[PDB]
Design an enzyme around this catalytic site. Structure first.
Site, PDB file in Angstrom:
ATOM      1  N   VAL A   1       0.773  -1.233  -0.028  1.00 10.15           N
ATOM      2  CA  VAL A   1      -0.126   0.002   0.103  1.00 10.15           C
ATOM      3  C   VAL A   1       0.930   1.162  -0.104  1.00 10.15           C
ATOM      4  O   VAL A   1       0.473   2.481   0.111  1.00 10.15           O
ATOM      5  CB  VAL A   1      -0.990   0.036   1.032  1.00 10.15           C
ATOM      6  CG1 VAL A   1      -1.993  -1.015   0.964  1.00 10.15           C
ATOM      7  CG2 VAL A   1      -0.325  -0.172   2.659  1.00 10.15           C
ATOM      8  N   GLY A   2       2.123   1.080  -0.514  1.00  8.26           N
ATOM      9  CA  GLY A   2       2.998   2.079  -0.437  1.00  8.26           C
ATOM     10  C   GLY A   2       4.220   2.417   0.069  1.00  8.26           C
ATOM     11  O   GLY A   2       4.697   1.161   0.824  1.00  8.26           O
TER      12      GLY A   2
ATOM     13  N   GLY B   1      10.318   3.754   4.458  1.00  8.54           N
ATOM     14  CA  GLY B   1      10.265   2.256   4.538  1.00  8.54           C
ATOM     15  C   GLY B   1       9.198   2.045   3.451  1.00  8.54           C
ATOM     16  O   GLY B   1       8.615   2.818   2.796  1.00  8.54           O
TER      17      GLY B   1
ATOM     18  N   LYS C   1       5.188  -2.450   8.549  1.00  5.38           N
ATOM     19  CA  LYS C   1       6.112  -1.415   7.715  1.00  5.38           C
ATOM     20  C   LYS C   1       7.630  -2.107   7.857  1.00  5.38           C
ATOM     21  O   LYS C   1       8.005  -2.317   8.935  1.00  5.38           O
ATOM     22  CB  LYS C   1       6.169  -0.237   8.512  1.00  5.38           C
ATOM     23  CG  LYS C   1       7.066   0.838   7.913  1.00  5.38           C
ATOM     24  CD  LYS C   1       6.852   2.386   8.281  1.00  5.38           C
ATOM     25  CE  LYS C   1       7.449   2.581   9.797  1.00  5.38           C
ATOM     26  NZ  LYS C   1       7.673   4.236   9.885  1.00  5.38           N
TER      27      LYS C   1
ATOM     28  N   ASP D   1       1.759   9.488  13.397  1.00  4.40           N
ATOM     29  CA  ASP D   1       3.024   9.922  12.513  1.00  4.40           C
ATOM     30  C   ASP D   1       3.772  11.160  13.394  1.00  4.40           C
ATOM     31  O   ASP D   1       3.774  12.422  12.880  1.00  4.40           O
ATOM     32  CB  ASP D   1       2.462  10.608  11.022  1.00  4.40           C
ATOM     33  CG  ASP D   1       2.435   9.294  10.122  1.00  4.40           C
ATOM     34  OD1 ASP D   1       2.779   7.949  10.294  1.00  4.40           O
ATOM     35  OD2 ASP D   1       2.248   9.786   9.085  1.00  4.40           O
TER      36      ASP D   1
HETATM   37 MG    MG Z   1       1.561  11.251   7.787  1.00  4.13          MG
END
Ligand code: MG
Ligand code: JGM
Ligand code: CL
Ligand code: CL
Ligand code: CL
Ligand code: CL
Ligand code: CL
Ligand code: CL
EC number: 2.7.11.24
Length: 343
Positions: A26-27, A29, A46, A161
């Site tokens: 999914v995209g 790391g 991840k 995040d």
């Molecule tokens: Mg973010």
């Protein structure tokens, strides 16, 4: 030690415990979504990219793992698992981090949903509840913005995040800068935890109006938008700014008074207007704190002082420590093998 299985997806080798199934890319790391058969949760896995390639990178890897292992709060992302296929320190090179898979962020909500004042109360209450916890451990998030706030169908919210950014990433007409406190965007001074409260003010304003509060086309255009709303600084704040050039530039601007927030946020709950005036204060020493904001009357229907917990103490002395790559790597390996999963 669990059994691992190995597979190649989108040019990357993934070696993971058998419990993690249906890996789908999914995209910093690479990330796959997966199903965790032990817990029943959908998860994000991840795989860190080159975690020990330089001293700066090895220390950043250790910093991220220490932070994620500490955070245990309903409104903050936590760590479900961390693993390595290595059987010894000598063959240790890869680190994998597992968290709950997040769906929508607050961007999806603001752009695409019709919010009542009750929705804004509940969403901002949860951000402040999480920040009281984070700040109690002397942690500063530094990067609060709508894409770093996960929200579900029942309007429940989690902060993610953490700030662990380049000059190019902050240049121009970019959301990566629109929510930053002025003292940190402009490197005015050493900054405190209320940089995060400035960000909450910008997010709350956008939920009330549906529009970005300070969408500057560059750093200085953004500063001009900010000073038009809150007023130009007095001598008291000017003295706290380090750069003589920065002080000279600010004094070159024509002086402006603080605007009337009820005429900016037209029709908003008067208690919401009052709280915004206490968050969006230029001098960071005078901004409301997260613990003070939870006791504001805007949140009267949600505030429960017996259910707003603080964090265990967090030792950050490693941040001032100078070590070699292999020493940071050994510290990281110790934290991987000592991880204990949640209930
Ligand atoms: Mg973010
Ligand atoms: C008026 C003002 O605050 N200017 C800032 C601009 C700036 C922003 C980010 C940087 O990395 C460097 C400069 C300033 O001069 N700060 N010292
Ligand atoms: Cl397993
Ligand atoms: Cl979580
Ligand atoms: Cl490895
Ligand atoms: Cl964003
Ligand atoms: Cl003037
Ligand atoms: Cl600690």
């Amino acid at each position: 030690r669990p059994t691992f299985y190995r597979q190649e997806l989108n040019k990357t080798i993934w070696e993971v415990p058998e419990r993690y199934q249906n890996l789908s890319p999914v995209g910093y790391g690479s990330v796959c979504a997966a199903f965790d058969t032990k817990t029943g949760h959908r998860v994000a896995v991840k795989k860190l990219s080159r975690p020990f390639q330089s001293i700066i990178h090895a220390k950043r890897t250790y910093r991220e793992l220490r932070l994620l292992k500490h955070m245990k709060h309903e409104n903050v992302i936590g760590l479900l698992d961390v693993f390595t296929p290595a059987r010894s320190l000598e063959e240790f090179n890869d680190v994998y981090l597992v968290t709950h898979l997040m769906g929508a962020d607050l961007n999806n909500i603001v752009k695409c949903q019709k919010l009542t004042d009750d929705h804004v109360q509940f969403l901002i209450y949860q951000i402040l509840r999480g920040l009281k916890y984070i700040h109690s451990a002397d942690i500063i998030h530094r990067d609060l913005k709508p894409s770093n706030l996960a929200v579900n169908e029942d309007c429940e919210l989690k902060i993610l995040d953490f700030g662990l950014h380049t000059d190019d990433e902050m240049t121009g007409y970019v959301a990566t800068r629109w929510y930053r406190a002025p003292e940190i965007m402009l490197n005015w001074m050493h900054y405190n935890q209320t940089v995060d409260i400035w960000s909450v003010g910008c997010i709350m304003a956008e939920l009330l109006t549906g529009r970005t509060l300070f969408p500057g086309t560059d750093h200085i255009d953004q500063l001009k938008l900010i000073l038009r709303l809150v007023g130009t600084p007095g001598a008291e704040l000017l003295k706290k700014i380090s750069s003589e050039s920065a002080r000279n530039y600010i004094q070159s601007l024509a002086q402006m008074p603080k605007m009337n927030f009820a005429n900016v946020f037209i029709g908003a709950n008067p208690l919401a207007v009052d709280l915004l005036e206490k968050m969006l204060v230029l001098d960071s020493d005078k901004r409301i704190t997260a613990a003070q904001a939870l006791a504001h009357a805007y949140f009267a229907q949600y505030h429960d002082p017996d259910d707003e917990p603080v964090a265990d103490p967090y030792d950050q002395s490693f941040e001032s420590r100078d070590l070699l790559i292999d020493e940071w790597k050994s510290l990281t390996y110790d934290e991987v093998i000592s991880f204990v999963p949640p209930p």
